[PDB]
Design a protein around this ligand. Structure first.
Ligand SMILES: COc1ccc(CC(=O)Nc2cccnc2)cc1
Length: 186
């Protein structure tokens, strides 16, 4: 099946907890995969304009590890719950992708999670201005704008709203699309 095939692909790239004990300032992100209309999508947030770091930018759910977290995956799930109401029973964490090093002292660990078909986002307005889906296949043929660095523009055909996706967020989306969608029969 589509979902079993995605999970099998994702598992081959799982680094596990290899890098997780290293003494960094630690953040986790959840790359939430949603199946709608026979296709996989990624769920993104738009960060509230109130937030000090990167207000109004497109981001994956996630945030800073805290002492309650049993592990890095727990960080991602806690933060996703806080931001979009995703409950742990509504997500299956399939793997841990390559961590992202930033600012010399920070390590961001991404987890890919399969999201339950009955999940409905409940954006928490103190953290998140918007939640939206992008079909995973979009990231194979994105609409690219150069601002000099590359920015994706995605227009939701449901409402015509255009979102700009960039940076680590755009990078991770492409990675996940390659992993899951490369070399598939039609
Ligand atoms: C320092 O670099 C990063 C650290 C954390 C994150 C993830 C994140 O904070 N996501 C979020 C938070 C609030 C609302 N929506 C999404 C991304 C980059």
């Amino acid at each position: 099946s589509m979902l079993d095939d995605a999970k099998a692909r994702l598992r081959k790239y799982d680094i596990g907890g290899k890098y997780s004990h290293l003494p960094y300032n630690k953040y986790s992100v959840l790359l939430p995969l949603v199946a709608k209309e026979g296709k996989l999508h990624l769920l993104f947030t738009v960060r509230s304009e109130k937030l000090r770091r990167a207000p109004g930018e497109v981001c994956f759910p996630g945030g800073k590890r805290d002492p309650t977290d049993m592990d890095d995956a727990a960080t991602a799930l806690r933060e996703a719950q806080e931001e979009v109401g995703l409950r742990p029973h509504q997500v299956e964490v399939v793997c841990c992708l390559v961590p992202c090093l930033i600012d010399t002292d920070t390590l961001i660990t991404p987890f890919v999670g399969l999201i339950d078909h009955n999940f409905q986002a409940q954006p928490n307005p103190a953290e998140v201005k918007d939640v939206f889906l992008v079909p995973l296949a979009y990231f194979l043929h994105p609409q690219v704008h150069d601002q000099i660095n590359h920015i994706f523009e995605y227009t939701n055909p449901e409402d015509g709203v255009t979102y700009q996706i960039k940076g680590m967020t755009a990078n991770l989306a492409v990675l996940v699309a390659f992993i899951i969608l490369e070399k598939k029969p039609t």
